[PDB]
């Protein structure tokens, strides 16, 4: 067997916008994903989070599914504008009541809650004031964080400030592909720095309010390999690693500076006098969460942004067109240990999209998803054998859900959702996962 360590947490993950539906129910304010998805042309097939998996109403059934799979941890997010509809000021009781029932039901079933404070659904009221571009967001974020900690910290001891900082900054403000849908490189690198500042203020407030709790942060990561051994290609791959992965945010947290190749490129776009904020940004955290899905080959290209371009390879891909490179999860894990040595690490999301179909007697035979999860879990195990202090792994996702600019066309679940009826069907991957948990590993 590939046996995991004793007490290793096997989990599943979702996010509020992607599964809940009912975005304006019970006094909630609009989010940027609401306005973005309700703008024609931004999301495939005109899809929105208006309904999604109707988790707002079906949450208790969904937790009974988690319990039936036997996951010991559930990473979910809280919708900011359900808690503070104007972003700051008056707290909405109905929003607290919704998540309190989730928390209490989890604890009563001995599932550990991991709460993500921010998983991309910014209150639209704050977007009108510049959102992540406005330096004052660090204080609004601290104040929202306080509200959660003072209401939920008695029961929840594992917290994540922000999910996928790079994506919020770059995809949302440079590429315009996610909310709020901008294309400005200066705004983009301003958001990078403000997300760090908001994380930091959040942690300080956490040390005052949840003294027996653990707080961390989650990064997207890709495994970048150079197209050749030539110095310029190696540098291009290191540049992509420094920009796209955990060093963009951990170099400031651990070393007090942005990574070196990123600075060469982006010094001009960062706030003037950003160095004045470093001391604050450097707050101790309890763990690092890493997401991972795919790898990319990259080369030096003197006519591309940042002198880098991607080179497509003839490797198996998911339905997203993403290349399947399981060894990437091992090098990412081994890389964070070597470069920053965090005392505790989680994979907070790993999974795949494939075009599932419902068979015969209501079964989803997703052999493709099982093979993907197996290969990546085996690499994670190898990372633990080589000293990485990995405490847990979470599958993205529990449920098929709204895949941001892809809409409902991309299914990541270990549980299928029929959107015509809201029926849930556990997939062959879910029963396979359940069995991994029962053996605490592979065989």
Rounded to whole angstroms, the Cα distance separating 403 from 320 reads 10
How many structural domains are present in the chain?
Answer: 1
Bond into 135 cis (ω within 30): no
Two tokens, residue 372: 């993907």
Rounded to whole angstroms, the Cα distance separating 124 from 129 reads 9
Q: Considering only CA atoms, which of 346, 320, 322 is closest in space to residue 332?
A: 346
Spell out the residues 6+ positions from residue 309 whose beta carbon is closer than 8 angstroms to its own.
Answer: 298, 299, 301
User: Residue with structure tokens 């990437």?
Assistant: 328
Torsion of CA 30, 32, 33, 36, to 10 degrees: 110
Check: CB of residue 412 under 8 Å from CB of residue 396.
yes
Rounded to whole angstroms, the Cα distance separating 251 from 245 reads 11
How many distinct helices (H) and strands (E) make up the chain?
Answer: 17, 15
Rounded to whole angstroms, the Cα distance separating 343 from 38 reads 42
Q: What is the CATH number of the domain that holds 160?
A: 3.20.20.80
Q: Identify the domain containing residue 380 by its residue range.
A: 1-443
Geometric angle at alpha carbon 326, from 321 and 328, rounded to 5°: 95
Neighbours of 281 (CB within 10 A): 19
Angle at which helices 55-69 and 93-108 cross, to 10°: 20
Pairing of strands 158-163, 214-219: parallel
φ/ψ of 264, rounded to 5, equals -55, -40
Strand partners, 183: none
Angle at which helices 55-69 and 428-439 cross, to 10°: 50
CA quadruple 54, 55, 59, 64: dihedral sign = positive
DSSP state of 109: T
Spell out the residues 6+ positions from residue 312 whose beta carbon is closer than 8 angstroms to its own.
Answer: 297
E-strand spans in 325-389?
Answer: 345-350
399 to 2, 18, 23, 65: CA distances (angstroms): 27, 9, 18, 10
Distance of CA 312 to the CA centre of its chain: 25
424 to 66, 194, 387: CA distances (angstroms): 12, 39, 39
- For residue 175, count CB atoms less than 10 angstroms from its CB and return exposed for 0-12, middle for 13-18, buried for 19 or more: middle
DSSP track, 386-427? TT--EEEEEEE-SB----GGGGGGS---SEEE-TTT--EEE-
Spell out the residues 6+ positions from residue 211 whose beta carbon is closer than 8 angstroms to its own.
Answer: none
- CB contact burial 178-210 (16+ within 10 A = b; e otherwise): bbbbbeeeebbbbbbbbbbbbbbbbbebbeebb
Name the method of structure determination.
X-ray
User: Residue with structure tokens 């299914």?
Assistant: 411
Rounded to whole angstroms, the Cα distance separating 123 from 88 reads 9
Rounded to whole angstroms, the Cα distance separating 379 from 85 reads 43
Q: Can you give the C-alpha Rg of the chain in angstroms?
A: 21
Helix (H) or strand (E) holding 116, with range, is strand 112-118
Geometric angle at alpha carbon 240, from 237 and 244, rounded to 5°: 150
Check: CB of residue 427 under 8 Å from CB of residue 418.
no
230 to 226, 234, 298: CA distances (angstroms): 8, 6, 12
Neighbours of 326 (CB within 10 A): 22
Pairing of strands 390-396, 345-350: parallel
Pairing of strands 2-3, 345-350: unpaired
What are the start-end ranges of the H helices in 245-319?
A: 247-250, 260-266, 278-281
Rounded to whole angstroms, the Cα distance separating 442 from 423 reads 30
């Amino acid at each position: 067997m590939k046996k995991f360590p004793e007490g290793f947490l096997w989990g599943v993950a979702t996010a509020s916008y992607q599964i809940e539906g009912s975005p304006l129910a019970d006094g909630a304010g609009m989010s940027i994903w609401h306005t973005f998805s309700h703008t024609p042309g931004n999301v495939k097939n005109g899809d929105t989070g208006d309904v999604a998996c109707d988790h707002y109403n079906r949450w208790k059934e969904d937790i009974e599914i988690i319990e039936k799979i036997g996951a010991k941890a559930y990473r979910f997010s809280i919708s900011w504008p359900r808690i503070l509809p104007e972003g700051t000021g008056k707290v909405n009781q109905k929003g607290l009541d919704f998540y309190n029932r989730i928390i209490d039901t989890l604890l009563e079933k001995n599932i550990t809650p991991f709460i993500t404070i921010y998983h991309w659904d910014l209150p639209f009221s704050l977007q009108l004031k510049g959102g992540w571009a406005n330096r004052d967001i660090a204080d609004w974020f601290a104040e929202y964080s306080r509200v959660l900690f003072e209401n939920f910290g008695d029961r929840v001891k594992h917290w994540i400030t922000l999910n996928e900082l790079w994506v919020v900054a770059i995809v949302g403000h440079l590429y315009g592909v996610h909310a709020p849908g901008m294309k400005d490189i200066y705004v983009a690198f301003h958001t990078v720095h403000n997300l760090l500042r908001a994380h930091a203020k959040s942690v300080k407030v956490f040390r005052e309010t949840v003294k027996d709790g653990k707080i961390g942060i989650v990064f997207n990561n890709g495994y970048f390999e150079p197209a050749s051994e030539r110095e310029e290609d190696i540098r291009a791959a290191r540049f992509m690693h420094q920009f796209n992965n955990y060093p963009l945010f951990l170099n400031p947290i651990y070393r007090g500076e942005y990574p070196d190749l990123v600075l060469e490129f982006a010094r001009e776009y960062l706030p003037r006098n950003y160095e004045d904020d470093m001391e604050e940004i450097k707050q101790e955290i309890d763990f690092v969460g890493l997401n991972y899905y795919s790898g990319h080959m990259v080369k030096y290209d003197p006519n591309s942004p940042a002198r880098v371009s991607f080179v497509e390879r003839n490797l198996p891909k998911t339905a997203m067109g993403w290349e399947i490179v399981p060894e990437g999860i091992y090098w990412i894990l081994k890389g964070v240990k070597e470069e920053y040595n965090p005392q505790e690490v989680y994979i907070t999301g790993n999974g795949a999209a494939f075009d599932d179909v419902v068979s015969e007697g209501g079964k989803v035979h997703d052999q493709n998803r099982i093979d993907y999860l197996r290969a990546h879990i085996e690499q994670v195990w190898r990372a633990i054998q080589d000293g990485v202090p990995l405490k847990g792994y979470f599958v993205w996702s529990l449920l098929d859900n709204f895949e941001w600019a892809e809409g409902y066309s991309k299914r990541f679940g270990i549980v299928y959702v029929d959107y015509n009826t809201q029926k849930r069907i556990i997939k062959d991957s879910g029963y396979w996962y359940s069995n991994v948990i029962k053996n605490n590993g592979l065989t």
